[PDB]
Symmetry: D3
Subunit: 151 residues, 6 copies
């Protein structure tokens, strides 16, 4: 199998446009394991630390504002190449470059309202998971299909 | 509209059998608002208080064991008649009496593995919400469709 | 077979909440033939002639205004007992009494925002059709699946 | 759990209208276990024996001919009360009488083109299983999720 | 946001094979806004003008005849780069060349039966809009979720 | 049109994870004709003759065992370029390289549990068909939608 983890976040447009069940379903049906799940109004401090590598960017302020302007769904998902492949499943950062079949390709249009965030790397995801989740909140268990998902 | 709330819980068979996204989707698409959402390995104490009115019942022990044996998804949903209608959406307690179209009617078979719990009343739901959720964890916001959902 | 027709209209809340395709799907997969399909902001006059019989009632004032406040998808469907069955597929007028699996049961909450209308009798349907559609807009053709839908 | 089985056949109209996957998906998602599956053009002899308790009905000769006019998907499914709950899933003999959420309620219109057959009792269904299948065609395995579907 | 529009037509094969709802649902769920919708049997004249830039092609005469052999669903859709991203959603002219996740990739096989048309440029698409619709048939309204689809 | 055929088999992980109906759906909605469909525990001999060309390789040992450890759904589908397009719909052999919208891209994670097999050439397909099916099990009939799928 593989116990590798990623942080996935449903941005507040996703919640507003009723895409939560649908986004979760796509991770479930793929075979990934739900580790942690929280529905939270997120803070500016939290978001700034998360998006620190983009402090140098003109969109930063607006991004943090858009990211603070409503509830998000904070999620951890476990599996083999889950960081990498989860990003393929999301599609490109810009929805207009995201292929049909992906979450953004199917469900959104404009870069500044792209419904969903995913960990760009394992390093980042761990940083992000810890930042967003306490270790208490992370749940561990075995999928009843595990042996059919992984040899 | 209506700000009435209910506690809905996805029992650990639901999580195991990959029905979370699908169960959430059915509440979203109905028009109900996500208030609170937690993915938690629940305790025996928590469950016993929740299922206290059934202490007198032969299945109680097993129920609590089944309910403790894996992660659950704790949920709060807001809307007009949400307690009552959410129970219709779940179907009957026994899946063999639940009509096709309902969650249990579509997704499960046996009373002791009925994937999902719902608040039997407002009183119960409040008791249950408080029992399961802290007020910090409950999120409040306005649906961008609210005026099309409610006159 | 049968050439019975009904009139189905998707209301503005139905359109605003992105349910047009889902609804049409339900009629298609059932095996009913699409005869007529337009998209329109309905004039107050038309809405008054359409809802004529409910003038006396106290929700007529807000009704016409709300049905004029956005676009409607006006439809004609054909088949054996479309009128009667169409109404069953829609569910009860009040969504609180609408069973899961129905359009209203699955997708809406309050009667003032009940997403859809269907004709209540063959008589009403043909009247509504004459009112919303011009004859030349009703299209005639034979389903390729016809002999598999009807004996 | 339960080792009870039922016989389900997708009739020629169900095959022709593209509902094989949809119908299998409903039995799969319900938790029932697939035991037998075959694709075939049923003989008049087989069909006359299958429908022997109806030889005295006005619709009998046409039923046989219609059922012989294209291929069918014969299936065997296992689970607790799978015969009775399988029938609830199909709907009523008459699609008009079948509720939205049921296979016939959603997917078909006319009694003579009702897309699917199900055993009407445990005894009928085993008689039907022995008739369409050899015991060696029936496959035995255990669902990876069985502990989660049955207590 | 963006007020750019495109023309989309569901071809006779798309109507006949029950994909009207499915196709509308994909544009709806993507965040694009429905502007115009009509159901009609297109004339040879209209179709010859629609396809005027192809009058010199070997497939032209048959394309026109096929497009005239049953009814089509004519639509207008609005949004940022809706013309270009609308084409990405459809797939390639040849279904064989279209990727899973696209409308043609999922729903059809042969180039001469590719179920759907889309404007190939902003200028083509407006020319196509003016040709199939009168400006008064196009409906103006604002999506309740527009702040969440566009920054 | 075209009478080209391919061989598609759902593997035991595909069956165990409840994906049989979903997969068949994908081929149906595309417009390919179901020719053959059986459900079987495949004998080690058959699996060795089937996977003959991969005897040398180091995963052959675990392969046969795993493909014998549960049931497979063996299928024959017909249509223009089924073989080549069928493989595209399936996705790349390794699910990590499989694009969203594909069967493997949507539903599985690791190559050892890649849920499905499709023939890699017309030659292989016909060989596999001769191996898994008896001639009399391949059913001939004409889709009611045929003239709408092919020119
Ligand atoms: N050009 C832009 N304009 C507005 N917002 C942007 C832009 N680029 C990126 N963003 C926002 O910042 C987030 C982070 O950007 P980046 O880390 O480069 O991509 P990703 O989110 O795919 O990791 C994006 O998801 C998006 O919400
Ligand atoms: N006869 C039974 N056998 C095993 N478990 C049962 C039985 N009846 C009820 N339960 C379990 O106890 C839970 C609570 O029962 P009850 O409050 O009567 O119904 P509900 O859950 O519909 O409110 C059920 O959801 C189910 O998990
Ligand atoms: N008490 C009410 N308050 C607000 N709107 C109502 C009320 N009752 C009915 N309506 C609206 O008026 C429409 C017409 O009412 P009626 O003819 O009784 O139902 P239907 O349209 O199902 O035949 C309904 O579709 C509904 O949206
Ligand atoms: N009045 C009728 N006209 C045409 N066909 C009928 C009629 N009644 C029943 N049939 C056909 O005969 C089949 C067997 O009938 P029956 O055994 O009474 O119902 P069921 O299939 O629900 O057990 C039905 O599934 C249906 O296709
Ligand atoms: N080689 C062909 N054979 C039959 N029909 C074709 C062929 N090429 C194109 N067509 C038809 O003509 C339509 C218009 O062609 P074109 O404008 O080149 O593609 P598009 O529709 O992608 O803009 C296509 O949608 C297709 O149905
Ligand atoms: N490195 C590997 N480890 C385990 N199983 C493998 C590996 N490579 C291939 N397989 C399995 O063997 C099957 C046959 O391999 P191959 O013929 O290369 O792929 P395909 O079946 O897509 O043509 C694949 O479907 C896959 O499940």
């Amino acid at each position: 199998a593989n116990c590798e983890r990623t942080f996935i976040a449903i941005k507040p447009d996703g919640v507003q446009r009723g895409l939560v069940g649908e986004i979760i379903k796509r991770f479930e049906q793929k075979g990934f394991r739900l580790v942690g799940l929280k529905f939270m109004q997120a803070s500016e401090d939290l978001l700034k630390e998360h998006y620190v590598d983009l402090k140098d960017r003109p969109f930063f302020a607006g991004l943090v504002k858009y990211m603070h302007s409503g509830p998000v769904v904070a999620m951890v998902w476990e599996g083999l190449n889950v960081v990498k492949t989860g990003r393929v499943m999301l599609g490109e950062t810009n929805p207009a470059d995201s292929k049909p079949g992906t979450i953004r390709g199917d469900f959104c249009i404009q870069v500044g309202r792209n419904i969903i965030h995913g960990g760009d790397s394992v390093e980042s995801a761990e940083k992000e998971i810890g930042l967003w989740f306490h270790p208490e909140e992370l749940v561990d268990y075995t999928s009843c299909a595990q042996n059919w998902i992984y040899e």
